[PDB]
Amino acid sequence: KHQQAVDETLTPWTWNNNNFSSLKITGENPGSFGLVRSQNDNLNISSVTKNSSDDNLKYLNAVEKYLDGQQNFAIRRYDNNGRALYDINLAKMENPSTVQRGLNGEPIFDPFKGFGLTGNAPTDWNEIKGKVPVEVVQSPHSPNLYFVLLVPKVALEYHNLNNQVVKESLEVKATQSSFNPTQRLQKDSPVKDSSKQGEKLSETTASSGMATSTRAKALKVEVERGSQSDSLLKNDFAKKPLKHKNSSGEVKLEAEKEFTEAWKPLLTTDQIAREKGMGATVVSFYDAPYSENHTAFGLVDHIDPKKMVENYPPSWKTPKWNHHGIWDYNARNLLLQTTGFFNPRRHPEWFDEGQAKADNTSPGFKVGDTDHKKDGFKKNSSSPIALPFEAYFANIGNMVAIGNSVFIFGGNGHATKMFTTNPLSIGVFRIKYTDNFSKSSVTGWPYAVLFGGLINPQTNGLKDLPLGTNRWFEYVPRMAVSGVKWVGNQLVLAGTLTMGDTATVPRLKYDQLEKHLNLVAQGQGLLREDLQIFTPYGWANRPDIPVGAWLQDEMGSKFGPHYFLNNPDIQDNVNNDTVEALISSYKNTDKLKHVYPYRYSGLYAWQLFNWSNKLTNTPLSANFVNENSYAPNSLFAAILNEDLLTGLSDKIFYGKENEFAENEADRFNQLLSLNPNPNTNWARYLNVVQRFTTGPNLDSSTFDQFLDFLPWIGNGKPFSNSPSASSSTPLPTFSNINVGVKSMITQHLNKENTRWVFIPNFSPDIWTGAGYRVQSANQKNGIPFEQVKPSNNSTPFDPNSDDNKVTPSGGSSKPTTYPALPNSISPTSDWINALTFTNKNNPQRNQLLLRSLLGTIPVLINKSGDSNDQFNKDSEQKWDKTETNEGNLPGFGEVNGLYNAALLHTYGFFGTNTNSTDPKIGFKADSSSSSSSTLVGSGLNWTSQDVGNLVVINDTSFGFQLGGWFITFTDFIRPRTGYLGITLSSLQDQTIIWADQPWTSFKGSYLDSDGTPKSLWDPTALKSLPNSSTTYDTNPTLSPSFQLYQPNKVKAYQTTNTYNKLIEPVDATSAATNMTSLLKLLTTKNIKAKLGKGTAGGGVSQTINTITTTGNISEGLKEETSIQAETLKKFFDSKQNNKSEIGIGDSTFTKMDGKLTGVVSTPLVNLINGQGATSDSDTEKISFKPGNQIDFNRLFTLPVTELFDPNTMFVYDQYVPLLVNLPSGFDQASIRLKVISYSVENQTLGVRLEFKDPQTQQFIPVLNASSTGPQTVFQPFN
C-alpha cells in the first residue's frame, strides 16, 4: 500500500495565476517538488446545474464535488537528477499523519527511519484533501520543512463555470439593432438649478495697498460650526446651485436602473472566510526523500480574506468619498463622474455586492439634504472595500519563507481575470510560525500601507509618477505579481502596479459633457482606459473650483476669472502687480477660503502636476489623489525590507489621523500631514519599499527618445519610423527632435526656475514637435497674444480691458496677460520652461512604455478602409506640413503625448508596414467638413496582467516575461551610470503575437543551466474567444484588449493657423449613427483582418545575448553639443541597425515536439515536462562498498567517533576509500562522506556520498552510491 508511489497518469503542469511548475530544492537532499496533474478531458461542468433556488455558493460546492470525482492533482518529489521519487496526492492519501514533535516543538526525525508520525490527520483534512497544490516553497533555515499552497478545484475551472454565474462587467444585450458605444453612458450635462440661487457663492465686501484692479472680486467660501448637532452655522462648500438634467427622470448615476443584470463576485469576503474549503490554504509539511517515513504533515492555515480586510485603512470603509468631501462630491456627481478614491462603478471586483453599489449614493456622509448646511456629516455606509472571490484568488500565489514567517504576495490575477475585469493582488499575507513551526498566526497588510513611504529619490528613472498617498490612504496600489525573489542579498518584488488615476485628473466645464464623451466615460467607469485621452477644450481652468463658483459668468462673455474653459493663453502673469491685486488682496482665515479671480489654467502636465498624486521628496504628501487605475499601468520592481516584513506586528492600528472628518467644519481646517498618536502603529508599515524601478533609468524628454527606439511586436517596425528618397518621409510618434520647427529659448514662466547664471557652450533651442503654432515661417520665436481665445458670440477677448489690466500706486494700467506664448499646444507639446503649455508628462510616458511593449496603444480613426472611406497616404498625408491640417494631427480625441499619424504609420494602418497592400486606414484632418472620429485598438490582445514568473539571472539582475517581451532589470540592484538598465527580448511566433487570447500559450519562464533565461510557449494551448454566437453575430466582440471608445466630433480644421487655438469639439451623442464602418473596428478581429493577420512554433524562447558593456547609452546622454534628449535621439538613430548593442532584440527560439506543460527544475537540471533525466556520468563509477567488503578491524572495532571530525562531521580523508569504491586513479578530494547519524553505543555510521561537481565547485550527492540513494548505514556484521 505505497500510498504515495509515483502515479504515471499524472504529468507536470503550470498554474496560470503564478506560473509555478516546480520548486528547485536546494541543500542536503536536493531535487524538485513539481506540480502534477491528470489529463482527462470531457468534463462538462455543464452537467452541474443551478436550479435558481440556492445561490452561487450552493452551485460552487456542487461543482467542487463534481471536479472532486473527475480531476486529480499531487506534487511529486524528484531527485537531484530529475527522476521522480514519490508523489504526495492529498486526495488519495488514506492515512495522512502529522509529525511527532519534542516538547520544544521540534519534529522527531532520524535520517534513515524518517519522521515520527502521530497517526493523526492534519486539522480540517476533509476540506483540504480535495484542494489542488499550486505552489511549494522550502524553509531556508529549517531543514525538511516545506510549504504547500492549496486552492479549490473550482478556482482552476473558474472560467468554465455557468455564463450566468461567471460573467463580464460590460453588459452585452442580445440585440441586432445597431451599435452605439454611448448607449450605456450618461452624457447629459447639468443645468442651473433656479430653485436655489442663494447657493451661488458671494463676492468679498472690502479690505495703502499699492496694486489695484477692476477685476471681479474673489468668491468667499465661509464655514462655521455653530451650536447644532446635525447642522453647520455656515457650510459654503455644500452650496450646489446646479442640478442633473431632467429627462422626466434625472440624468444621474443609478446602479438600480443601470445594472439590471449587475456583475457580482463568485463569493463574498465573508463566504470565503466561513467556507474553509472555498479558500486558499497553506500547509506546512516535512520531507526527507531517502528516509523511510519520508513525508509528514505539520500546520494547516487557511488564508482568511478577513485577516487582510481587517488591516485596510479606515478610509476604505467609505470609498465613495474622499478628504476633500462634499465640495468634490457634488462637483464629480453633477459632472456624471465617479465619486471617491475607489468607487464600485470603477473597480467592482473589490466590492462584496459588485455593480449593485455602482453609483454615488450613500457615500457614508449626508448628501443632497433639503438644507445644504446639514450635508457632509458622517452617516451610515453600506459600500466598503472588501476581498471577494475574484480579487481574493488574484492575491493567491507567489509565496516566500523569510525566517519564521511565510509570505503570500499574490499572482498575476489571470485565474479570475475576464476581458472586462481586473482582479489584482491588493496586499501581502503572512503566516508567522512559532515554537519550531508548531504554532502559527495569519495576517494581511494592503500594499497601500506598505508603499506609504514612497518618494521620488527611490527611483532612478521617471520622476513624479502618481504613487503618492496621504493620512487617509486614497492611493490603492494593486499588483499583477511576477514574483518575490532574492537577487543576491536583496529581496525583490516585481510585476506590474496600478498607479494613481492620471487620465481623469482634469475636470470638465459643466456644459462641455456631450462634446467630450471619451473623457466622460473614463470618469463614468464605462471606458476602462488608463491612458490620457487628449480632449482638452472642455476642461475647466481648475478641477478644484467648487459648484457655487460655476455660475458667476454663465454667458461666458466676462471670461469668468473664477471658472472658465481652460486656456493657458488667457492665464495671468506672475508680475508683483498682478499677484498683489488679484491674490494677496484677499486673505483666507479660520472660517473663510477664497475662489480667487486670478486666471489660472494649463494643459495636461500642469493639471497633473497640481492635482495628481505625484511622488515628491516627502511621503504621504499627495493632497490630491484623483482615483485609481483600472488595469496595471506601470512596470514595477522594488527592493523590500526583509526585517520589516518579518518584524511588523499582525494587527495594524490606525488613528483618528487616518479617518475622514465627521463634519465639513472639522474638514475645513484639515492639515494634510498629521503626527501619528502614540497608541497607533500604522506609521511603522510605510517603509517596506527601500528602492524601486518602473522601467529604464531615463527621465522626461530623454525617455521619449527611447520610446521611439523600441519597436512594435505586431510589425517589427519601430515607433521612430527613422529608416528610409522623399521629403514626405514619416516622422517619429514620441519624439519632438527634428519634428516641426526649432523655437528659441527665453520666457521662464513660474516657480522662479530663473537661473541664467550659467549659460551652456551650445544654443539650447527646443523643437516644437508636430501640431505647432507659428506667427509666420520667418518668425518662429514665440507667438504673440493676438492668436487669442475669441470665444463668446465670436467677440474676442480684449487683453487691455479694464478688468484684464492692473494699475500700481502711481498709475499706468498694464494688462495681466502674457505678450507671447509657446509655439505648441498639441498633445506632443514638450515645453521645459512652460509647464502650463506642456502636455507630455512622465505619468503618461510610464504607461506608454508598458503599452508599447504590450503594443496596445490606441489610434484615432477618421477613415476606415472600406471602398468609400479610404486614406490615400500619398495625397492626404504631408509629413512636412505638420503646422496645417495636412499634418493630420487630430489635436482632439487621440492618446495624449504622441503624434497619431506617426503611430498609425508605425502600426501599418496606412502603408506597407503590416499589409503588403496598403490597408488605407487613418485620420484625415478635414478642412471641408465636421470630423467624426473614434479610437481603435492595434489588433493585439496582450494585457498588463500578462506577467510571467520572476527569473533571477545573477546577484544583480532579474527579469520576467511581460506579454511578448522578456524584460530584464540590469541596473536596479547595482546601478551602473550611463546604462539604460533594461533588456527586451521580443517573441518571434507571429501566430501567438496576434492571437485572440495570447498569454494562454505561455507556460512559464526558467533560467537555464547555460545561464540564459528561457520561456515555454505552446500555441496548441491558445484559448479561443468564448463562442461563435449565431453565424458569428453582427455587433462588438469582447476580447482581452477590447475597449469601449466613445466617438469624438470636431468642427472642420483650418487650412491655415490650425493649431494656433485649441481644437473645438461639438456634440457627438448622435455621431455614432454614421460611423457604422469605423465603429466596426472597435472589435479586434476586424482590424486583424484589414491588416492581413489573424487567420494562419511550439517550444522555448531564449533571450538575447547580453554582455557587461550591453546597455551603455552614456555617449547618448552627454549634453556636449545638444541637450540630453537631442544627443540621445542622434545616438539611437546611429545605432538603428544594431539595436542588440543597447539591449533590444528578437528572442531566439528552439522548436519542441508536443504540448509543453511545464518544467521540473533541480539545482542540476531543468527538464521540459519530464525530458530524459539521466544518471550522472561524473559519479557513475563511484559507489559504496558492499557490507561484506568492509575491513571491520581498522578503526571500526574502536568507537565510531574516531572515524569523523566532530567539528566538521565528515569522515576523515583516510577512511573514505575504505567505505567507497572508486575508479583506479580517482581524486579523493573531489568526494566526501558526511555523517548523517552515528551511534557509538550501537556501532552504526550513517553517511551520504557527496561529489565536487566539475561545473559549480559545490558538492552534489552521488545518487548512484546505493540501491536506495546517496545515503547508507555502516554497521559491523549486523
Curated annotation (Swiss-Prot):
Region described as Disordered: 176-225, 783-823, 865-887
Segments of skewed composition (Basic and acidic residues): 185-202, 871-884
GO biological-process terms attached to the record: adhesion of symbiont to microvasculature
Biological function: The protein is the major adhesin mediating the attachment of this mycoplasma to the ciliated epithelium.
The name this protein goes by in its record: Adhesin P1
Subcellular location: Cell membrane
Family: Belongs to the adhesin P1 family.
UniProt main location, coarse: membrane
Residue stretches of biased makeup (Low complexity): 203-214
Composition-biased stretches (Polar residues): 789-798, 806-816
Species, as recorded: Mycoplasma genitalium (strain ATCC 33530 / DSM 19775 / NCTC 10195 / G37)
GO CC, one annotated term: plasma membrane
Membrane topology listed for this record: Single-pass type I membrane protein
Keywords linked to the UniProt accession: Cell membrane, Cytadherence, Membrane, Signal, Transmembrane, Transmembrane helix
